[PDB]
Amino acid sequence: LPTIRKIAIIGAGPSGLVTAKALLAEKAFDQVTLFERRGSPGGVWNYTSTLSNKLPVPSTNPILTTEPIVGPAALPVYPSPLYRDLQTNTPIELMGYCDQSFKPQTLQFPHRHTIQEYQRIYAQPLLPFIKLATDVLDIEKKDGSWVVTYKGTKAGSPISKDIFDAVSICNGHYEVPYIPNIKGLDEYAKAVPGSVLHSSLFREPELFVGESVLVVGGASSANDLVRHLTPVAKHPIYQSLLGGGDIQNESLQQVPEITKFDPTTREIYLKGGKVLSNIDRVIYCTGYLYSVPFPSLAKLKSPETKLIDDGSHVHNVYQHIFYIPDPTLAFVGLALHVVPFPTSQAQAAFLARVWSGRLKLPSKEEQLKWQDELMFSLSGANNMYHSLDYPKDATYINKLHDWCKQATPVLEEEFPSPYWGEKERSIRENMWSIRAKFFGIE
Amino acid sequence: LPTIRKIAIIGAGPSGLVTAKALLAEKAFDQVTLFERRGSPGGVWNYTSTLSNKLPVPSTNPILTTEPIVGPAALPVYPSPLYRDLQTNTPIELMGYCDQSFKPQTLQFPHRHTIQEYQRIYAQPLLPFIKLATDVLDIEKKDGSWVVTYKGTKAGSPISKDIFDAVSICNGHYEVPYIPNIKGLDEYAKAVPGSVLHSSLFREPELFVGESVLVVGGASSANDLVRHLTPVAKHPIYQSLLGGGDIQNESLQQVPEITKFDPTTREIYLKGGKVLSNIDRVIYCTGYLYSVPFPSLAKLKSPETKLIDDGSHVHNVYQHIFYIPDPTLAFVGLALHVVPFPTSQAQAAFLARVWSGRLKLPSKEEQLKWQDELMFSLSGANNMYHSLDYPKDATYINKLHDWCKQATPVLEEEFPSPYWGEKERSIRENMWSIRAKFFGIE
Ligand SMILES: Cc1cc2nc3c(=O)[nH]c(=O)nc-3n(C[C@H](O)[C@H](O)[C@H](O)COP(=O)(O)OP(=O)(O)OC[C@H]3O[C@@H](n4cnc5c(N)ncnc54)[C@H](O)[C@@H]3O)c2cc1C
Ligand SMILES: Cc1cc2nc3c(=O)[nH]c(=O)nc-3n(C[C@H](O)[C@H](O)[C@H](O)COP(=O)(O)OP(=O)(O)OC[C@H]3O[C@@H](n4cnc5c(N)ncnc54)[C@H](O)[C@@H]3O)c2cc1C
């Protein structure tokens, strides 16, 4: 319904917040409303000593409903995966929006305190636009608009409904855990309640002192955990790498992928015949699954209409933003292997100018071609669908920056579009080396 | 045992941490060990979405054992009373240690994020000196030293014991809630599980939207809550002031003290015959009780030996620091109505020079006189025992600063002693006005 006036935003985290600012800066919408289940904005940057009550083991269903921790004396809490001693893996010269910088004397890879404070400051002017402690239950096109059903968080809230011209989903993709279904893991897990964990549960390393641990995974998250646990867990720390690894020291023993979990002997069978025993904790650092837990959108199975299948990615989203069949439904924040704030802002700026009619999306056929060419380059590896590892992210954010400049008419105040010059791209290229040196590792 | 070499510190919060630095700066002790039940230092500045599991209602026993939240997947969590949107009520020009300042561009009354980050930085060099996730169970003089019994926090830790020459208690006094035993409060509370709260449980104001609330108390904490709840709770907000109050608007109705709680009609009887009904939440902002939960010290009841009686204060502590009968037992952080970090540091510097023999405490008789004169000035109001409201705190911190200068010999590196000049004292005198104007209130 082209002339958009009432927009709904699902999520008040970094993505939803920059989406609101970009949208409001268009001066063309009469209503920009944000919905957030948490009592406060900032998404995951809301550190919680509280852990999830029940970790699905295994977890392969991207529809899984996030169950908050409730009590009679508190507001429902939605645990965040951030741990206590966490520090960014993204430099201050790159992370964060281009129109709000970090106070001087900030560490290059600061503690989450700094980023949580960052979000707080960024979100403040938007509090009157957000409906806090409110869970969006479903989203569907009814008649000529989108009907978003939502129940206020808090025991006894009544289910409510409101129509919108457009809807922007910024619900994040690090909530529903991904733990591959191995042989005998379910049983092994239920046998000893805290024996199997997922990165989303980690908080304080002191829990693992003296314990013999097995970290499964080889991505950044798993390597971080191996380092964090090195000074407390019993030596050596075991790590399961799909293809195995080269590190076999006294403190780190990389081993190949897992074959089976023997519940009766509690032995862990690794490919190649190697067997592990007396493992106090097994920690799955195998990431998450994308999720669109809204019945009206989840039922869509059709190749041309579906959004979610296995949770490896969100399908049918041109440029990772607009739902091809109906571009009044868009997503911001889907990007993988990027610098979240700048990339989400890049998408927001573009999204804003497209929904206010100051920019035109190419034909539906060409959008589908973009998708076709992308799928082909993935070679069956759909979980790389949204991945924009450098230089893809740089090219991408600069591509959106140049499409925005073409917006018309030119507003007196133009919501900024980030752009990565030669100096920025360089830092992004050696980002992990800059990080490694900063923390003295690798 | 004068020549002190091995010192134990109970608590790794602001008080315990500055105590460690001061102690280690004396270069006279062979062992300075800190004990902390939490997995990390910083005391209350460890924000926790987690609330206490069972709020005693009423609460009048200062011996009450703090029960952490346990689970099989996490380290035991000791909930802190800090709420989500909290900002200091102490200016950056005054709070914080004199040898570590706030980064530039910090708000004068910053968010807890800033202070939590502050503590993190301050505590880092002390991590190797702290025994984390370890609860001290008891403290007693055995033979010629102090035997501190402690059990590692974490299911299945074995009870351990270690002897020390001196022990410094910095366990804080904002844990054990104080809720006066009124007529029919226990029953009224147990009838509807979340009907009665204490400030230590507050976290997110959105919980109280639409609810009719009664804040009981008139101190700073209660006024803060009244303001925080004004934009969400049903109007008006009720506040119970011991002597009643002058504000009776549409949003705030101050009423006199509570007489009885009628459990069958759930009506709240206020002195003067006024009666309240349909009160969804009653929130006690009546502070805390001091606590010395160590059997060997709690059993002491004697006028000349006792430490705790009703929890209104810690008795027999000269200058609020040294246990008169045995000055090898000291307390830091007991001060009330002060600026915590500077005041605790002031005491630490003094404590350090007294335990290393570079300063001499006056006779036992004179110490007891100091106490006698203090008790007399309190006029039965023992809960004002440690209160050093300006200008007492200024005079006090400057008094300790001048006694420290007299230490001998002069060390190459002297642990700083804070001093409040004319400029500092002025800010401390109008502290609440400076705060009121900063937040635009009063
Ligand atoms: C362990 C960890 C470490 C990280 N470290 C970094 C780092 O160093 N640097 C970096 O750049 N990024 C880091 N990230 C990435 C992080 O995702 C981003 O910084 C940031 O979270 C971007 O968030 P967003 O708004 O897209 O999503 P964030 O209930 O995920 O999320 C969304 C918000 O929408 C809400 N929401 C979702 N669905 C609903 C619904 N149906 N109803 C109501 N509310 C809903 C959520 O509860 C939340 O408040 C890390 C993340 C993790 C988990
Ligand atoms: C709601 C609130 C707001 C505040 N706002 C401010 C403010 O704006 N400015 C300000 O200056 N102050 C403020 N304060 C005051 C605050 O007390 C101080 O900033 C700071 O906490 C000083 O702490 P400490 O080390 O003396 O105690 P903090 O388990 O209290 O405490 C002690 C530490 O010792 C540990 N411990 C105690 N007993 C044991 C044991 N037996 N075994 C093991 N560990 C033990 C504790 O668990 C903790 O980690 C506020 C406090 C509250 C509760």
UniProtKB/Swiss-Prot annotation, chains A, B:
InterPro entries: FAD/NAD-bd_sf (IPR036188), Flavin_mOase (IPR000960), Flavin_mOase-like (IPR020946), FMO-like (IPR050346)
Function: Flavin-dependent oxidation of thiol-containing compounds. Probably required for the correct folding of disulfide-bonded proteins.
Single annotated GO MF: NADP binding
Required cofactor(s): FAD
Record: residues binding FAD: 11-15, 36, 44-45, 89-90, 135-136
Keyword NADP set for record: yes
Subunit structure: Monomer.
UniProt family annotation: Belongs to the FMO family.
Protein name: Thiol-specific monooxygenase
Keyword NADP recorded: yes
Segments crossing the lipid bilayer: none
Pfam families: FMO-like, NAD_binding_8
Keywords: FAD, Flavoprotein, Monooxygenase, NADP, Oxidoreductase
Name of the gene: fmo1
EC number per UniProt: 1.14.13.-
GO biological process: cellular detoxification
Main EC class the enzyme belongs to: oxidoreductase
Binding positions for NADP(+) per the UniProt entry: 88-89, 221-224
Organism expressing this protein natively: Schizosaccharomyces pombe (strain 972 / ATCC 24843) (Fission yeast)
UniProt GO cellular component terms: endoplasmic reticulum membrane
PANTHER family the record matches: DIMETHYLANILINE MONOOXYGENASE
